[PDB]
Amino acid sequence: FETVPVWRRQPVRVLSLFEDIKKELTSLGFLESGGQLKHVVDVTDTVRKDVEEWGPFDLVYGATPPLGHTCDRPPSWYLFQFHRLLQYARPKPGSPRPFFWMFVDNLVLNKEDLDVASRFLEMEPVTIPDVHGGSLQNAVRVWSNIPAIRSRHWALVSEEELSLLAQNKKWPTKLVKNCFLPLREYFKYFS
Amino acid sequence: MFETVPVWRRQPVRVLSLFEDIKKELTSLGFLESGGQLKHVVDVTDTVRKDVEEWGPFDLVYGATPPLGHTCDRPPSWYLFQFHRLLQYARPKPGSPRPFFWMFVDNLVLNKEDLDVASRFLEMEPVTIPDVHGGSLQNAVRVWSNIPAIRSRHWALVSEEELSLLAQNKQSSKAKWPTKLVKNCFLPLREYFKYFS
Amino acid sequence: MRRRPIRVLSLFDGIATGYLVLKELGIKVGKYVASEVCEESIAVGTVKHEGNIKYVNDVRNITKKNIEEWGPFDLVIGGSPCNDLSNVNPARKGLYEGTGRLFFEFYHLLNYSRPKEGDDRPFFWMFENVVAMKVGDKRDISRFLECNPVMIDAIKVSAAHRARYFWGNLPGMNRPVIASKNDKLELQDCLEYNRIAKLKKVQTITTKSNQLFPVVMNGKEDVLWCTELERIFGFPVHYTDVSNMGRGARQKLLGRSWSVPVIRHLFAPLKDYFACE
Amino acid sequence: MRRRPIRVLSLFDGIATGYLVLKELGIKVGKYVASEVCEESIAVGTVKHEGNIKYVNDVRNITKKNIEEWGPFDLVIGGSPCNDLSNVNPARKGLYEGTGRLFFEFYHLLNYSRPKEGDDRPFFWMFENVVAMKVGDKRDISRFLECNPVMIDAIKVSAAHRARYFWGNLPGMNRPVIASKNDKLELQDCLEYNRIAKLKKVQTITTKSNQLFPVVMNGKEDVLWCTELERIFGFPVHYTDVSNMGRGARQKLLGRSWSVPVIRHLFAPLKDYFACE
Ligand SMILES: Nc1ncnc2c1ncn2[C@@H]1O[C@H](CSCC[C@H](N)C(=O)O)[C@@H](O)[C@H]1O
Ligand SMILES: Nc1ncnc2c1ncn2[C@@H]1O[C@H](CSCC[C@H](N)C(=O)O)[C@@H](O)[C@H]1O
């Protein structure tokens, strides 16, 4: 998707699954105050027509509950449902257009759940840590095709240090908000 | 059964005695005379049907296992099986019926399982002939034979336990064949053959 | 507009029930790629069909590149494991963990194998599982496959109960099942010599062994024999007399298989789409 | 005379090889009386031949009256147990104790069934046992049967060693054995798909489990499957797939079997005396 000139950039149309990143996207100038966001939490009864009738989406965001919140679901439910609804929203091959998707895990997915998430999203996850004082306080794993997200990786963080964090323990939206910034070359900035 | 044979043409017995020899006994009741009308052989492993015809014809086939105590070369059933084989070699062919008798004796040498084999191959169950003195059991033999009065001589009073223990102590002692017990069994035959006085 | 040999992708293939039915229908099989990991189940399909099946091991090591190189595929069939979806199991783990989540591998590879846009070549597919699943999982599967199943009980053409849901787009999937008379519809038809059936339909068979003594031979109870089980499921006799397998292994394989007269019904309309004899 | 169906007395019948050969030759069987006590061996004979065999139990409970009314018999066959006659069994008990003494039951019942000397009807018999017996046992058996055996090895008509002595009076017992085009003389001809034989004749097969691993499949070595064992012995495939029998039970029955191609060589000249089709 080669970039868009500043004149013809339109407001982004986003589908936030499970968790709501409306407020985070406002503070980056992706949405204007007052609605281009559809946020659903229980997608159990969502069919392709519902995703189609809700206006064409440019960004499909999904994330599992925070690490502390004792979960409604099995962790794989948020991955499988995201994958299904993501297919419903992506443009038909006849009309290519800017389309992005992001799935984020806050160390809720089990070790076995990780391999199937990477096979269904066809990408190895990105480790976005929260480290202060030389010790790792929090982290998230995200899968997405947003242009600049893989170099955000921290190879210093390892799986043991991640699961050790998971056993010791709100959604740290602060770790994922900066990853949307490569998208302002495609959609309108609201000042 | 066979028929009365009158005294005028009663002829000498022709006896085939296997394993054990009963000439000294049979001669003492007037079935033989000092001179051989009795063929004696103990190793029948290589004797075949024509050998029995060459030595024959025979009027009585006798066989008996080694005496109690005397540990045999052969397995006890060997004397039963071989006795059955050669007995068939000597039988009159059914077209020419004539007085023909046979007898097999066990001196408590065959074990329990060999007894059913013996009783099956000889088509009768054995006769217990004991040797009791002072009211106690000193020895005994088991008899299979077609000789007419052979059954009646059975001692129903002797048990199988009384017999099996008898075999225990006398082989533990480790005694030659007590031919007095079977000697009277041949007497119903002098009405078929010659008597030598 | 010319008939060519059919190209099949069979996930969770088991004892090659899919390949057996297609050949029995006289359909030419060009390619039969089977994903299966149970060693004795693969020995059956190897010997009984003499190396015509391309086995490719675990369904979770099949890539998008795997589908496009092995393909194109005209028919994608599958029956993902049932022990973690069925009311039989107190330790049932549901559709989302255990072996129940293996369904999503079928859904994943089905979208991979489905033809591109603009291409409208014939593309058929079918997914089977048990009826005895919580209503939440049955509808979740219908949500991913984007269609509702038809229920076909083998009792109508087999000598046993076997109610199973069938998702797919096969022609005439909803048409009524009517059994041939070569089908053995009551248990007495499948027994060996001098064995009497207590029932005319035996209760659904699973991987493990009243109605577990459904035969009386010489006036006494007895279990079913392997050959008798094979006829209940519609397989050829001794179809599973493979590689020293005993009663336990053979009942494990046939206990989780498809009843082939049901598959023969479902697959039969495909003869008018591919090269045949 | 006019040729009539054959009436057989089979002692130590096993898996009814005798009945199989006579029916395979096209000979009519009026009566087939089998003495056999292993219920698994009886199971295969009962259903593979659909109740045409009249099974009797212990050979030692057959009385002279039994022979008179069950008969008359035209053919008396038998292969008595061998574990107490074989040389490389260290605990062998000889011809006179253990199972070896069961031979005399054959010799006993043979003369019972033998016709009278006034009767001159055709009457054939055959006794089989192992070549690996002490010369004293082989001698005594010939003394009781009043004849010497012929040695026929299954290696000439099958894919395995099996030297066995054959006493009897069957027509042409001494004529030379020649294999048929339908006989499978090499081990590779008896294997399933994708299986390579290292040997071309395997060593004498017994009841017990690199001659234990004589086939290689996909580079790895493997044992033989019972379907392959049944071919080696010349039996129909799946002849022992009866009564949920597994690897061990099927090998036990076949391990003590007759090599049926050798038996059909012996039984073939019998067509001339009995009715065929
Ligand atoms: N991870 C996996 N990858 C491929 N196959 C698997 C698998 N896990 C289980 N299986 C196989 O999937 C099968 C499901 S039972 C379905 C059997 C088949 N429909 C038939 O008719 O025979 C089982 O045989 C099992 O061995
Ligand atoms: N006491 C007895 N009465 C009858 N059969 C017996 C027996 N003891 C053993 N047997 C049987 O005799 C057989 C000897 S092996 C002979 C097998 C047979 N000839 C075949 O071709 O298959 C064994 O199968 C054993 O089961």
DSSP states of B128-175: EEEEEETTEEEEEEEEEE--TTSGGG--TTS-HHHHHHHHHHHHHH--
Q: Per the structure, how many domains does chain A have?
A: 1
CA distance B128 to chain D (A): 24
Give residue D103 CA to ligand 2 midpoint distance, Å. Answer: 11
Do residues D159 and D201 make contact, with C-beta atoms less than 8 angstroms apart? yes
Please report, for residues A154, A183, C246, the alpha-carbon distance to residue A128 in angstroms, rounded to integers and kept in the order given. Answer: 7, 18, 54
Smallest Cβ–Cβ distance between D193 and the set C47, C192, C247 belongs to C47
| Residue D71 structure tokens | 């008969």
Q: Which residues of D touch B117 (CB under 8 A)?
A: 101, 104
Find, among C97, C26, C112, C106, the residue nearest to C65 by Cα: C112
Residues D152-172: b if buried by 16+ CB within 10 A, e if exposed: bbbbbbbbbebebbbbbebbe
Beta bridge partners of A143: A103
Q: Over the Cα atoms of chain B, what is R_g? A: 17
Dihedrals phi, psi of D127, to nearest 5 degrees: -120, 135
Q: Could you count the other beta carbons within 10 Å of the beta carbon of residue C48?
A: 22
Give the nearest ligand 2 atom to D260 CA. Answer: 21
N- to C-terminal Cα distance for chain B? 27
Find, among B161, B179, B185, the residue nearest to B24 by Cα: B179
Q: What one-character DSSP code corresponds to residue A44?
A: T
Strands, sheet with A126-132, edge to edge from the N-terminal-most edge strand:
A37-40, A14-17, A59-63, A100-105, A135-144, A126-132
Do residues A173 and A108 make contact, with C-beta atoms less than 8 angstroms apart? no
CB pairs under 8 A between A and C: 37
CA distance C247 to chain D (A): 5
CB-hemisphere CA count at 13 Å for A126?
Answer: 20
CB-CB under 8 Å, A74 with C140:
no
Q: Which residues of C touch A119 (CB under 8 A)?
A: 60, 108
**Is D223 within 8 Å of chain C by CB?**
yes
Give residue D201 CA to ligand 1 midpoint distance, Å. Answer: 38
Touch between A and C (at least 3 CB pairs under 8 Å)? yes
Amino acid at A111: K
Please report, for residues C263, D164, D229, D265, the alpha-carbon distance to residue D159 in angstroms, rounded to integers and kept in the order given. Answer: 41, 15, 10, 16
d(CA C63, CA A74): 25
Find, among D35, D133, D34, D150, the residue nearest to D84 by Cα: D133
Strands annotated E in chain D: 6-11, 29-35, 53-56, 75-78, 124-130, 150-153, 163-168, 196-197, 215-217, 220-222
Please report, for residues D12, D81, D130, D228, D230, the alpha-carbon distance to residue D206 in angstroms, rounded to integers and kept in the order given. Answer: 17, 12, 11, 15, 13
Residue that is written with structure tokens 């024509």 in the block? B50
Q: Considering D38, D82, D226, D276, which one is annotated as catalytic? A: D82
d(CA D106, CA D187): 34
Smallest Cβ–Cβ distance between A84 and the set C101, C118, C143 belongs to C143
**Is C96 within 8 Å of chain A by CB?**
yes
Do residues B143 and B129 make contact, with C-beta atoms less than 8 angstroms apart? yes
Give the nearest ligand 1 atom to C80 CA. Answer: 14
Residue that is written with structure tokens 């009767």 in the block? D119
Find, among C111, C119, C118, C101, the residue nearest to C145 by Cα: C111
Beta bridge partners of B192: none
d(CA C31, CA C144): 27
In this structure, the dihedral spanned by the alpha carbons of residues B84, B88, B90 and B92, taken in order and rounded to 10 degrees, is 140
Residues sharing a CB contact under 8 Å with residue B159, sequence separation 6 or more, in sequence order? none
Give the nearest ligand 1 atom to C59 CA. Answer: 3
**Is C193 within 8 Å of chain D by CB?**
yes
Q: Are strands C215-217 and C220-222 parallel, antiparallel or unpaired?
A: antiparallel
Catalytic status, residue C82: yes
| Residue C50 structure tokens | 């003499």
Bond before C72 cis per omega within 30 degrees:
yes
Do residues A17 and A174 make contact, with C-beta atoms less than 8 angstroms apart? no
The subunits that touch chain B, with at least 3 C-beta pairs less than 8 Å apart, are D
Do residues D274 and D6 make contact, with C-beta atoms less than 8 angstroms apart? yes
Q: Per the structure, how many domains does chain C have?
A: 1
Find, among D68, D159, D60, the residue nearest to D106 by Cα: D60
Q: What one-character DSSP code corresponds to residue B16?
A: E
The subunits that touch chain C, with at least 3 C-beta pairs less than 8 Å apart, are A, D
Do residues C160 and C205 make contact, with C-beta atoms less than 8 angstroms apart? yes
Residues sharing a CB contact under 8 Å with residue B136, sequence separation 6 or more, in sequence order? none
Angle at C207 between CA D194 and CA C50, to 5 degrees: 15
CB-CB under 8 Å, D241 with C227:
yes
Q: Exposed, middle or buried, D212 (CB in 10 Å: 0-12/13-18/19+)?
A: exposed
Do residues D20 and D260 make contact, with C-beta atoms less than 8 angstroms apart? yes
C11, C17, C35, C37, best to mutate for ligand 1 pocket (most atoms within 8 Å of CB): C37
Q: Which residues line ligand 2 (CB under 6 A)?
A: D 12-15, 17, 35-38, 41, 58-60, 79, 81, 102, 256-258
**Is C104 within 8 Å of chain A by CB?**
yes
Q: Which ligand gives the minimal distance to the CA of D253? A: 2
Q: What one-character DSSP code corresponds to residue C27?
A: B
Find, among A60, A50, A74, A79, the residue nearest to A21 by Cα: A60
Q: Which ligand gives the minimal distance to the CA of C48? A: 1
CA distance B85 to chain D (A): 7
CB-CB under 8 Å, B94 with D116:
yes
Do residues C183 and C234 make contact, with C-beta atoms less than 8 angstroms apart? yes
Nearest residue of chain A to residue C143 (CA atoms): A47
Do residues A32 and A190 make contact, with C-beta atoms less than 8 angstroms apart? yes
Give residue C51 CA to ligand 1 midpoint distance, Å. Answer: 19
Question: H or E segment at B114?
Answer: helix B112-121
Q: Which residues of D touch B121 (CB under 8 A)?
A: 104, 108
Touch between A and D (at least 3 CB pairs under 8 Å)? no
Angle, helices C135-145 vs A75-89, to 10°: value is 30
Angle, helices C260-267 vs C17-24, to 10°: value is 60
Q: Could you count the other beta carbons within 10 Å of the beta carbon of residue C49?
A: 17
The subunits that touch chain D, with at least 3 C-beta pairs less than 8 Å apart, are B, C
**Is D98 within 8 Å of chain B by CB?**
no
**Is D104 within 8 Å of chain B by CB?**
yes
Q: Which ligand gives the minimal distance to the CA of D17? A: 2
Which of B46, B50, B119, B120 has the highest number of chain D CBs within 10 A, making it the mutation to test binding with D? B120
Angle at C106 between CA C178 and CA C161, to 5 degrees: 30
Resolution to 1 decimal place, in Å: 2.9
CB-hemisphere CA count at 13 Å for D202?
Answer: 23
Which of C235, C239, C241 has the highest number of chain D CBs within 10 A, making it the mutation to test binding with D? C241
CATH no. for residue A182? 3.40.50.150
Do residues D30 and D8 make contact, with C-beta atoms less than 8 angstroms apart? no
Amino acid at A93: P
d(CA A101, CA B155): 108
Q: Over the Cα atoms of chain C, what is R_g? A: 19
Do residues D199 and D212 make contact, with C-beta atoms less than 8 angstroms apart? no
Give residue D36 CA to ligand 2 midpoint distance, Å. Answer: 6
Do residues C236 and C216 make contact, with C-beta atoms less than 8 angstroms apart? no
| Residue D185 structure tokens | 């003389």
Amino acid at C162: R
d(CA A77, CA A68): 18
Which of C212, C243, C251 has the highest number of chain D CBs within 10 A, making it the mutation to test binding with D? C243
Do residues C115 and C124 make contact, with C-beta atoms less than 8 angstroms apart? no
Q: Which residues line ligand 1 (CB under 6 A)?
A: C 12-15, 17, 35-38, 41, 58-60, 79, 81, 102, 256-258
Residues sharing a CB contact under 8 Å with residue A143, sequence separation 6 or more, in sequence order? A102, A103, A104, A117, A118, A121, A123, A125, A126
CB pairs under 8 A between C and D: 48
CB-CB under 8 Å, D118 with B94:
yes
Nearest residue of chain C to residue A77 (CA atoms): C96
Diameter over CA atoms, chain D = 67
Do residues D170 and D266 make contact, with C-beta atoms less than 8 angstroms apart? yes
Do residues A16 and A35 make contact, with C-beta atoms less than 8 angstroms apart? no
| Residue A161 structure tokens | 């240090």
CB-CB under 8 Å, A93 with C143:
no
CB-CB under 8 Å, C238 with D241:
yes
Q: Which ligand gives the minimal distance to the CA of D259? A: 2
What domain range is D162 assigned to?
1-277
In this structure, the dihedral spanned by the alpha carbons of residues D155, D156, D162 and D166, taken in order and rounded to 10 degrees, is 180
Amino acid at B191: E
Q: Are strands D75-78 and D53-56 parallel, antiparallel or unpaired?
A: unpaired
Map residue C236 onto helix, strand or coil: coil
Beta bridge partners of C215: C197, C222
Q: Could you count the other beta carbons within 10 Å of the beta carbon of residue A167?
A: 7
Find, among D213, D206, D257, the residue nearest to D235 by Cα: D257
Q: Are strands C54-55 and C29-35 parallel, antiparallel or unpaired?
A: parallel
Q: Which residues of D touch C47 (CB under 8 A)?
A: 192-194
**Is D139 within 8 Å of chain B by CB?**
yes
Residue that is written with structure tokens 């009159």 in the block? B92
